[PDB]
Design a protein around this ligand. Sequence first.
Ligand SMILES: O=C(O)c1ccc(Cc2ccccc2Cl)o1
Ligand SMILES: [Mn+2]
Ligand SMILES: [Mn+2]
Ligand code: NA
Length: 263
Amino acid sequence: AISIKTPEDIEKMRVAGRLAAEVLEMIEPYVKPGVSTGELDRICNDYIVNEQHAVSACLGYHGYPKSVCISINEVVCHGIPDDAKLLKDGDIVNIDVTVIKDGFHGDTSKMFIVGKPTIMGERLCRITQESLYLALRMVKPGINLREIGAAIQKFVEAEGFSVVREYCGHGIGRGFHEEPQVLHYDSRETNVVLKPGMTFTIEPMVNAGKKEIRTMKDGWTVKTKDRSLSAQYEHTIVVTDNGCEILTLRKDDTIPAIISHDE
Ligand SMILES: O=C(O)c1ccc(Cc2ccccc2Cl)o1
Ligand SMILES: [Mn+2]
Ligand SMILES: [Mn+2]
Ligand code: NA
């Protein structure tokens, strides 16, 4: 089944969601050519721990050694911060954050383009965010998650890109990952009708090339099989009576926090 968050739990989710979003707004100025992903991770952890007085849900997760996941270019997800990995002009980088505050999780990620952007990098990032946005605009009571996944896939493929099938969005609350699973493509296995109070994430992973991926021998890093670029954006939301409310909205987002479908 699915969990319906109480008004009180939703407020706690707003707090946690805001903190997760603020980690991304905070790190922005540091995402420069020459900086190491290891350094970015330390900055994020110190901020989460010393200033937000929260905890990273990534640290120790199944043995994961870092506080955030940082994925560059062909890396699809779960990139491990490393002091030896330096960002450079043209890189597209995803920093994925999940913090726990007052028992609840806030989960969000965004793409950052390093220094001088490349046209293809900007396009992939733009389309990926647009696929997340179109999905968010569909969220409202009564709609099926399958319809949303199908819409994301149709949009992405029309642009000549592909959607990663191995990973998905998910319910969230006192648990990092809870039911339901939010696939970003059409699937006969998906039959979930939304209800007010449900909290979950939408986080499509889009490849510029083919959908196939590969996991590295370090046990964490996932890359595109064809080494093409891959991008991802993620937001945590709560379903409302006439639409949804984005809990991890940032100043740079260009979609309303509260989306309504009523007249
Ligand atoms: O956004 C998510 O749901 C998400 C990102 C990363 C994870 C789980 C994970 C896998 C491999 C290494 C570290 C982590 Cl936190 O879950
Ligand atoms: Mn995440
Ligand atoms: Mn997530
Ligand atoms: Na990438």
